[PDB]
Amino acid sequence: DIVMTQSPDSLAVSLGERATINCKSSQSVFFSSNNRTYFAWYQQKPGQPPKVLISWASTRESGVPDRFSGSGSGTDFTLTINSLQAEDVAVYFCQQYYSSPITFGQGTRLEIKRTVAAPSVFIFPPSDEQLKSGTASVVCLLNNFYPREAKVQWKVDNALQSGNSQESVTEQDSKDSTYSLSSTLTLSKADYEKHKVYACEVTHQGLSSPVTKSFNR
Amino acid sequence: EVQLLESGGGLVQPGGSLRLSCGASGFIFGHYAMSWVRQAPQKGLEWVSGISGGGESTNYADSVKGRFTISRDNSRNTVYLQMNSLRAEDTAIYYCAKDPGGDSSPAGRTWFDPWGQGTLVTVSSASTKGPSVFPLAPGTAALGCLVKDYFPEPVTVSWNSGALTSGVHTFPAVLQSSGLYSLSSVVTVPSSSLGTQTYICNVNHKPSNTKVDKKVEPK
Numbered sequence: 001d002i003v004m005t006q007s008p009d010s011l012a013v014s015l016g017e018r019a020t021i022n023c024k025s026s027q028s029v030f031f032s033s034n035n036r037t038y039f040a041w042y043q044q045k046p047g048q049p050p051k052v053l054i055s056w057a058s059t060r061e062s063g064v065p066d067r068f069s070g071s072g073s074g075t076d077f078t079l080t081i082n083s084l085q086a087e088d089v090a091v092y093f094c095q096q097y098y099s100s101p102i103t104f105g106q107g108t109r110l111e112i113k114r115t116v117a118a119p120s121v122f123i124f125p126p127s128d129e130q131l132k133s134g135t136a137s138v139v140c141l142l143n144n145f146y147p148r149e150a151k152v153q154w155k156v157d158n159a160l161q162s163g164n165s166q167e168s169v170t171e172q173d174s175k176d177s178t179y180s181l182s183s184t185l186t187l188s189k190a191d192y193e194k195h196k197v198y199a200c201e202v203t204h205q206g207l208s209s210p211v212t213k214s215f216n217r
Numbered sequence: 218e219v220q221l222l223e224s225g226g227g228l229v230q231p232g233g234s235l236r237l238s239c240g241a242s243g244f245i246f247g248h249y250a251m252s253w254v255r256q257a258p259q260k261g262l263e264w265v266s267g268i269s270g271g272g273e274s275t276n277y278a279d280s281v282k283g284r285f286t287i288s289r290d291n292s293r294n295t296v297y298l299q300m301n302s303l304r305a306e307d308t309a310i311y312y313c314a315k316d317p318g319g320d321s322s323p324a325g326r327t328w329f330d331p332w333g334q335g336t337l338v339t340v341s342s343a344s345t346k347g348p349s350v351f352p353l354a355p356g357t358a359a360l361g362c363l364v365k366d367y368f369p370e371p372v373t374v375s376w377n378s379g380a381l382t383s384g385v386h387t388f389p390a391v392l393q394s395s396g397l398y399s400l401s402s403v404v405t406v407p408s409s410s411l412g413t414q415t416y417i418c419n420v421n422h423k424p425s426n427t428k429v430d431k432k433v434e435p436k
């Protein structure tokens with residue numbers, strides 16, 4: 001099969017700047033007889049299927065804003081996104097349709113850089129319903145922040161926890177370019193009832209000093 | 218207004234069989250080739266199968282040849298993917314995609330526009346388990362639902378049967394050490410509404426016929 005290789009695998013670009021995504025094919029997908037390159041670019045936004053941006057290496061598909069442009073021919077191709085917008089956050093795929101089977105690039109992840117935004121922090125105790133099953137989940141929410149890098153530390157009676165928490169981060173928002181993050185501390189009911197103060201400490205570039213949210217019982 | 222809507226995904230034991238369907242509307246279906254493209258957890262997009270407008274011509278990826286059969290109904294406006302002898306490596310989101318110009322030869326040697334939302338096919342020896350949902354109790358407050366211990370993916374979470382959509386974050390599922398997934402869906406609301414506006418998360422785990430509504434109240 002024809003192999004499509006994209007470079008880079010991921011990149012972050014500020015709003016209003018230019019993003020460049022490259023794709024190489026293992027053979028020429030240019031046909032000399034009809035002056036056509038059998039190449040296409042797709043955009044896949046979070047939670048959505050791919051949407052075609054560029055056909056024939058360089059033809060912008062209808063409805064695609066003209067700040068997207070595709071260039072190249074033969075084996076080396078480039079997608080250019082000028083004046084980057086928040087909604088451009090996506091994975092961008094290349095595809096050849098020169099010969100069956102059609103093949104796709106592995107994807108390039110586009111991250112939007114924006115101004116720093118501090119997280120809103122919330123802590124949630126385990127429900128009484130969950131406690132009757134023998135497990136306690138304590139949840140810490142970091143809402144609508146940028147950049148993605150953040151430090152969440154669980155403390156139980158001021159003792160630092162490790163190995164009993166998991167994190168999940170949302171895809172970057174297509175409108176305000178922020179992230180949200182959840183940290184879940186999982187304890188046995190017995191261990192949960194052994195202690196009183198459950199605290200979530202968040203360290204983030206948008207916070208001048210770490211923020212703690214806590215509850216008792 | 219071209220729309221493609223896939224269905225049929227779920228959990229399949231290895232060697233088992235599954236049929237995916239794709240409903241099309243908004244265009245003369247029989248005039249266009251349709252293809253199935255899948256996207257594996259660690260792999261990229263991989264074309265699976267294509268079929269001409271009238272269905273007389275088909276093409277298949279080598280990895281699925283002989284086990285997958287593509288067909289279409291040009292009256293019901295549906296395209297199908299029949300999968301037999303399924304393997305672990307067939308686990309993917311499966312998409313339905315339309316030939317933009319007509320009937321390209323071989324079937325599928327084209328770009329695609331548009332694509333459907335995808336349906337997840339999980340091939341695994343593990344058994345289905347539905348989620349337990351617990352409330353995350355709360356001038357803007359945050360609340361949510363904890364969707365714990367389910368298999369396989371996915372779960373869908375709506376709020377107030379769709380009446381509440383603004384401010385919703387449903388986090389990606391994280392695989393726990395138990396082999397089960399867990400996620401949270403949270404939403405921020407005005408604090409002045411807490412006592413008077415009811416908040417219910419609608420959790421749907423199709424692999425297990427689990428539909429749970431959980432009321433989330435201040436404690």
Ligand SMILES: *[C@@H]1O[C@H](CO[C@@H]2O[C@@H](C)[C@@H](O)[C@@H](O)[C@@H]2O)[C@@H](O[C@@H]2O[C@H](CO)[C@@H](O)[C@H](O)[C@H]2NC(C)=O)[C@H](O)[C@H]1NC(C)=O
Pocket residue numbers: 030035036037038056057058059072073074
């Ligand atoms: C050959 O075609 C190019 C552009 O056509 C193709 O563009 C895509 C369909 C894809 O298949 C590419 O690989 C091809 O190169 C012609 O270049 C255009 O020329 C017009 C003026 O005639 C100009 O306004 C456009 O900007 C040009 N576009 C590009 C991308 O260069 C070129 O003239 C053709 N050469 C021939 C027929 O000899």
